[PDB]
Amino acid sequence: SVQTAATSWGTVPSIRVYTANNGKITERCADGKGWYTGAFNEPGDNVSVTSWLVGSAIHIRVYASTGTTTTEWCWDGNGWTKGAYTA
Amino acid sequence: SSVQTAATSWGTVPSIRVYTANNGKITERCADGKGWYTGAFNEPGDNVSVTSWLVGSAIHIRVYASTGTTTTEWCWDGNGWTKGAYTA
Amino acid sequence: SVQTAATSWGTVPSIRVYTANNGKITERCADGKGWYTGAFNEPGDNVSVTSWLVGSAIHIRVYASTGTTTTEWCWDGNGWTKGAYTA
Ligand SMILES: CO[C@@H]1O[C@@H](C)[C@@H](O)[C@@H](O)[C@@H]1O
Ligand SMILES: CO[C@@H]1O[C@@H](C)[C@@H](O)[C@@H](O)[C@@H]1O
Ligand SMILES: CO[C@@H]1O[C@@H](C)[C@@H](O)[C@@H](O)[C@@H]1O
Ligand SMILES: CO[C@@H]1O[C@@H](C)[C@@H](O)[C@@H](O)[C@@H]1O
Ligand SMILES: CO[C@@H]1O[C@@H](C)[C@@H](O)[C@@H](O)[C@@H]1O
Ligand SMILES: CO[C@@H]1O[C@@H](C)[C@@H](O)[C@@H](O)[C@@H]1O
């Protein structure tokens, strides 16, 4: 099957669901209305996620695994960038 | 090969929910500050993820159950498990 | 492919990433000044994690699965101990 990971924040709430499918991770988003496709699109067969609020600003870390290599992807409001995580 | 689990918790007691995908079936184990018991959640799936949030003292849980390329969202809001609006 | 589970707490933040690799689950840690190897080391092919704060004290529960047997490991400030979880 496809593999998913989920995070949420606040009380509305905001939800982000990540799906690993055919070597690619994509993102679906809800913020109190309908679902929409998120900006996140990077390779992976396995995915985990965690998020935290710095005041009103959400920060997301997505851990994308292909073989024995896990790449950390960072959302800090402006774009998805590679993090310094190593195994 | 092995079962696949997802976990969420809330408050300081705490309350914990663990979801296990086992040979195409997802079941739920629960702790609320005593022992473990089997929860009301039972739906098909080979893969499960979960998130939860509090509105005051009221827990809201979203479980994402996947079979092949089809992900179904299940919603706990205090009364029972309902299918959610999630699509992909 | 390796399988990961991620949790975070606070606003720095603190992040823990658990990786199941060839029947071994290991832990990588970030507390605001780089990644280091954590004290968690247990057998398993699948891992999930949840954590919560009681005031300023962090508690972690890691669910490690081999076949159909899931073992819960507990961090409560001092060390990793066997939890009461069964299925
Ligand atoms: C506003 O942008 C949306 O929300 C952010 C928190 C991220 O999840 C991003 O990928 C998504 O497209
Ligand atoms: C500032 O560093 C960035 O954010 C931290 C919270 C970590 O996710 C780290 O790997 C990443 O490079
Ligand atoms: C009160 O009901 C128990 O706790 C709820 C929060 C849900 O996890 C439900 O499946 C479980 O049976
Ligand atoms: C009220 O709507 C329900 O809860 C939202 C937070 C979303 O999970 C949505 O898909 C679901 O149908
Ligand atoms: C202080 O010790 C570090 O942080 C704890 C919260 C645990 O993740 C432990 O395994 C790790 O070595
Ligand atoms: C106090 O009991 C310990 O912590 C609880 C929150 C549960 O994780 C339980 O399985 C564990 O034995």
Side-chain angles (χ1 to χ4, degrees), chain C residues 2-23 25-32 34-84:
Chain C
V2 297
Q3 182 265 314
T4 74
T7 195
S8 63
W9 64 87
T11 45
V12 165
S14 283
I15 309 169
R16 301 292 182 275
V17 180
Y18 302 86
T19 303
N21 184 355
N22 197 28
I25 303 165
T26 59
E27 175 196 45
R28 291 284 279 171
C29 311
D31 299 308
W35 291 91
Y36 67 89
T37 300
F40 182 94
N41 196 284
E42 298 300 345
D45 303 292
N46 178 262
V47 60
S48 67
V49 63
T50 191
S51 67
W52 67 93
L53 287 167
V54 180
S56 309
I58 189 64
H59 302 264
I60 312 166
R61 298 292 181 270
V62 175
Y63 300 92
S65 300
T66 305
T68 62
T69 296
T70 302
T71 304
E72 175 192 51
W73 296 101
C74 307
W75 179 273
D76 309 277
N78 304 278
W80 290 100
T81 59
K82 171 69 168 283

Side-chain angles (χ1 to χ4, degrees), chain A residues 52 61 63 72 74 76 82-85, chain C residues 12-13 15 30 35:
Chain A
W52 67 93
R61 297 294 181 268
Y63 300 91
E72 176 190 50
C74 308
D76 312 277
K82 190 183 170 178
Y85 173 87
Chain C
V12 165
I15 309 169
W35 291 91

Side-chain angles (χ1 to χ4, degrees), chain B residues 1-14 16 18-20 22 29-30 36, chain C residues 45-54 61 63 65-68 70 72 84-87:
Chain B
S1 182
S2 300
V3 298
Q4 181 269 323
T5 70
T8 194
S9 62
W10 64 91
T12 61
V13 175
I16 309 173
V18 182
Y19 303 84
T20 305
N22 185 0
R29 291 288 280 174
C30 314
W36 291 87
Chain C
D45 303 292
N46 178 262
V47 60
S48 67
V49 63
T50 191
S51 67
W52 67 93
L53 287 167
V54 180
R61 298 292 181 270
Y63 300 92
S65 300
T66 305
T68 62
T70 302
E72 175 192 51
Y85 177 87
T86 62

